[PDB]
């Protein structure tokens, strides 16, 4: 029974109320492959694993420009440690409590696992609200945070990275601290700038990792992007370096979108024409509208791209974007795939309408990982002590991508076509789950 | 003086009998080297290589399922460090002491040495016997033995592995703790499973590197697998693998054994039949007697397979599976090679049978090191946080086991057949000594 | 059953002749004991109590003033920490070996507990022989010997001292080392000058310490020092203070030897003479027959003191030194006492024969603790960073001899005279095991 | 205002001569850089970028060969880790003080940032005199000198290596000290010996990507080696192979020279002709003049190679050894460039007369970091447990000078010709700088 494990949970943690939710959610997908195989539910292994190995709650206190002492939360979750280090980004935002960080890292947790890399699952942050704030008042926030922090870091132990609130700048300030206080250069955070030991393709990873992971699913099931009209949503990050990939296969890219509307564009994208929408959309004013008129291109004022008739649809905007009206469109107009570049784009049921069709679907747990592998990879230059070439970085991000597709075809079913979320939802558990087993009582 | 050395050697160990017979088998084979090569003698090097670096000998308490308290006695042979950090299995066995674990650490010393991985030499293990214990007692027993063990224990200091008695799923138990009490997630044992950073070819590597080896050295000396004949004793993974791939260079193999009897099959093992051997032995009661049965195969009843006329034996069940009387035959009968899979099949004076009459013979030590080497290339792997695939891990296996041919056959003489004992042994040697010398007097 | 107890203890160290000896005796002692107080036996005490926590083997390498590199093998027997740090000497000595090292870390665990202070038990050494060596080739050694040493030893983990063939010097050199290495002046050793941590009282701690457990044990059977002829052998350290203080206590003390010979003096010790045998034995050359030879006092020329009549008689050279034949000449002269200054001096036929005639017999176990009480003391004085004046280390080790007297008292029977063997052994064993007992399985 | 900033650094410095003349230097070429790059002037960056990090200044007592305890002075400048771990040599000399050691490291920073790879910048050693030293003598003296040094090394927070006085066996000395004191085997030496740890290519190094790098800029602007005339000064390591490389790229290389003078082959070095040198100048005797006698060249007593006419001059000895006259007569004999195999070998005059006559000049600080590079890549190939081939070496040294090549382009201005000078210091200094800024003020 399902409710009750799950009100057994939640004696513990009466009042993490996204906490609840996500350990639902997990268990909710995993509950039939759970009752089929029954070794993964021994040793109480889902009691051991929704109880966090080691959470560090402790205080900040900084001072702010006007001489004034300010006292704040900060939290280090450490969830499992199971298939290597605790890994996951540091949030800084009003909000922030220990549910929200224990929501993000169990979710986090099989996200690691799901690309195949070493990482553990793990997620930080604080209620420290950076908006409004100096670059000198965060700066002296990350280093009295790290002042605590850094005695729990490491780089066999945890390895954090950004996520809201927390950038660039706060990693290189968090970063330095850390190297100051431990004398010890160690790669401790991902997302560190190229100076000191970032990596190349991290804007492009996402995008490009969409691209891999979906012509790997073309190709085992004899198709390709090559020659493919394919329409992507959304403009930004990901959805450029989608287009850039896509074309770089021979795909004709014909749309591109943000919340106000539709750019469409049948000849396709071309390398330029990608450049100056980057540009574009870089400004904080910038929309596809623009992109269009100086382009000379059809402008869909509101619409969404599913009207249009493509072999590939690429949704990555947003949640909820994709619902079962226009599935049904895509379908009727010959639809081949669909791969998720944003996080949760299409609704249960539209998912359910293009897998029953016999249409290839992505989730996005997987198809987007490539943000999250190449964290990994940074990892991997640190730990080699030789930055790699961009070429270099983006082919062994592809194998990456490819390994993330063999574990869901694993477990993806033996139908005509694999059931590509059965596999991402069960690779992800199995492969932590194994871990915990292996690894005794501990 | 040898004789000498040895007594001396012998003075501050009366009765470490297994350890004195492996110093007196290396000394015997380096000393001609020795006495055209003065360099090596210097610096009482000698003296400083018998003795150990360390040795912590421990006491492990740990709680029966009949609640009795049981005290066992652990050891860890840190025994050179000159190469690379120290690296060597843990036995559990009841047979285990002090003698016999320097005797296994030193030829690991000279073994890690020949791989060309910067690795040292250790060994370690408990007179704890696994016999009729129940899984939580051997796991109770890790533990406990890990709650000492772990301090002494690092991925650049001394990393472990398995041996008789511990298996991929003890390794799990110790692996786990480390990681637990070190909070700590860096490689510390080899043989980890692929869930948490073992290696893709790692079951493979012994019986695939030694018909590597094999079959360099045959053709060495004018001959090849193709179309020999091939005796393997032996069902475990070593043997396994090691027909698997004499069939894929032509081999007939025409023998598999285990503890109660022997296979003989004239027109040799196929992909299919090895296949169901396999799933035979897979479970803990099949017998290669059932697999004979199955196919209608000649059982031999407790014997082995060295009665038959072959032109390739390849022992790869246990030390001293080859003794005198089996060398006979097999020599009478016109065996032209013999390579070691398993650690020390053949005895001493069936050894030098086997030389004296002009069959090549591969010790272990260089033959069956891709066990080992493999277990560098999963340190490699782990260290650089970054998997390879199986071809990948197989290419450079291969490469490592050729390297290790040919210094052998560097150091084996002029002979009209290289001395792979004499080779192994002193390549091994030249390696540390080397290494030794350049570090100064520590 | 003892002999079964034993003889399981055996098993894993068949050829420890040394070992096997101390434990029979301690067993024996308590087996009755043990018969009355089952809970002394519960949860394999007695197994855990004989196996220790840990022993660290290693290879010492060094360069004499030849400029020949020598080999040499250490050890540090770290045999319980229940009651606190390991605590005992160090000994170089050329017949060194672990047996000998576990027989004396085993006696010294009893002996720190019966003082009261929170000491564990250890010892360690080297086969390394002092004899003939320069200062220079010592400090050689002794460095190398704590490049590998100083990690596993700590103010809260194992404090050496001196023993045979490490004195003041050797534990100078030794102490400087780790404090260079560690870089922390912490104790973490006993037997340092006054110049760097030193206790005063340290001299003479196991002489007066006799002479005070002597005496409460003479007091408690109708008797004293006052008055009594008082032979004594050996004339370092331990002789001389067993001599100041007891012509302290009033008696007449009459002989004084060394390897060569004795020193008769009917009249007795005095202030005068005392203070010029120290002076001569402040050499390591000095001897007897010279202080003999300046006070016009007889020589024996070699013989022992036995043979001279006297009330009370303290071994205080060697181990052995005290057989049957020397105890009939004291029985038949009339001897009323026996305390031990060395360690085992009298063989266990010659103390059984003294407790049959209804001699005194205080074992050295109990009576020459002193010395390590003082190591004690001398801990206590660097923790606190405040030395003590002479005055009040001596009251305190007066005390600590009076408790341990009273500890052997207590288990020392009801008969006619205390048996102190059998006292001390149970005191001894009671402090260790329950500790044992309430820290658990570990 | 360039004289009142380098006024400032000095007043901390008053008497630190090479110091002060190095951070004139730098700060001298890249003042125009700096006005026209407000951020790269903020935060008081430069005033941190002079000051390092951390210096540590110790005591080093060692026994000579007469047993007379000599006392010297060590340092460890730990300069900057903004990139990486502090990196860079040991150099023991009578002449080496802070201020020496001081300008090394500084420099040091901007040549490790340059070769792309993850290394800061560090330098040390001894006014340690190693001249007329036994051998037992320089081993103590490393090991005396590593037995303060270790605890401020890692493999990851100051990896250092050899310089003058330090060679092969002083790396191993030290190297092999570390490694015991910490029981830890992670590469914190470069320069080691292939049979621990060392790298092909290391000897080839700094000569090979000295070849390497000028060959870029010959092509940059429209020549090759090919076919041209080349000298070179010095006859050790650089100059060696800086000749071996240039005849393989088609050069006529027609100097090589000592301190006593310089031969002149006007038919060339070939492979035999260099053998012979090397094995000369491989001895203690060893001198260019008796190579010369040997073939029958024409040989300069005491003059150095630079009246002679070339197409590129390679200064490979010494500090110094090209002023302006030379220049002059280089110039004035149709030298087309200049690149520098030694450290800072052509004067600031001469070099500006080069400049200005339109020679192209490659300073040190770029055409010479080969081997500093180099000994990145074994710190990579330890990083990674696994030796590459010297073809892999030779590969990505060469893509590495290949990458400094761009970087100095791409910072040397528009002119007729890249001026490296104001290049190598651009980009070494940006490097640098973009790391201070991003890790905050720490």
């Given at each position: 029974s399902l409710e009750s494990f799950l009100n057994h949970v939640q004696k513990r943690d009466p009042n993490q109320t996204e906490f609840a939710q996500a350990v639902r959610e997990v268990m909710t997908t995993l509950w039939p492959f759970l009752e089929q195989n029954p070794k993964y539910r021994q040793m109480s292994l889902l009691e051991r694993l929704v109880e966090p190995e080691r959470v560090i709650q402790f205080r900040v206190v900084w001072v702010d420009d006007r001489n004034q002492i300010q006292v704040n939360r900060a939290w280090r979750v450490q969830f499992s440690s199971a298939i290597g280090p605790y890994k996951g980004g540091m949030r800084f935002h009003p909000s922030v409590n220990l549910s929200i960080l224990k929501f993000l890292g169990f979710e986090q947790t099989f996200k690691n696992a799901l690309t195949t890399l070493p990482m553990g699952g793990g997620k930080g942050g604080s209620d420290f609200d950076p908006k409004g704030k100096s670059e000198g008042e965060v700066m002296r926030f990350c280093q009295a945070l790290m002042t605590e922090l850094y005695r729990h870091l490491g780089a066999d132990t945890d390895v954090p990275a950004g996520d809201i609130?927390?950038?660039?700048?706060?990693?290189?300030?968090?970063?330095?601290?850390?190297?100051?206080?431990?004398?010890?250069?160690?790669?401790?955070?991902?997302?560190?700038?190229?100076s000191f030991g970032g990596s190349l393709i991290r804007p492009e990873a996402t995008g490009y990792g969409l691209v891999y992971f979906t012509e790997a699913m073309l190709k085992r099931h004899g198709m390709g992007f090559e020659g493919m009209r394919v329409s992507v949503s959304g403009s930004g990050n990901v959805a450029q370096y989608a287009i850039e990939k896509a074309m770089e296969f021979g795909a004709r890219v014909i749309t591109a979108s943000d919340s106000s509307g539709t750019v469409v564009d049948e000849s396709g994208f071309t390398k330029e024409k990608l450049a100056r929408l980057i540009e574009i959309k870089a400004s904080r004013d910038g929309r596809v509208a623009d992109y269009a008129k100086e382009f000379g291109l059809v402008y869909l004022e509101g619409q969404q791209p599913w009207s249009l008739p493509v072999d590939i649809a690429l949704p990555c905007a947003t949640q909820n974007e994709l619902d079962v009206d226009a599935a049904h469109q895509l379908i009727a107009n010959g639809v081949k795939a669909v791969a998720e570049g944003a996080n949760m784009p299409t609704t249960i049921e539209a998912t359910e309408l293009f897998q029953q069709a016999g249409v290839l679907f992505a989730p996005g747990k997987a198809a987007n990982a490539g943000g999250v592998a190449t964290s990994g990879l940074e990892m991997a230059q640190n730990a080699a002590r030789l930055g790699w070439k961009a070429e270099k970085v983006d082919a062994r991000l592809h194998h990456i991508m490819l390994d993330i597709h063999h574990a869901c075809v694993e477990h993806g079913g033996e139908g005509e076509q694999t059931n590509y979320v059965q596999g991402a939802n069960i690779a992800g558990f199995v492969k932590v789950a194994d871990a915990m087993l292996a690894q005794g009582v501990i």
């Open positions: 609130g927390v950038g660039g700048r706060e990693v290189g300030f968090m970063a330095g601290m850390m190297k100051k206080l431990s004398n010890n250069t160690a790669c401790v955070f991902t997302g560190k700038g190229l």
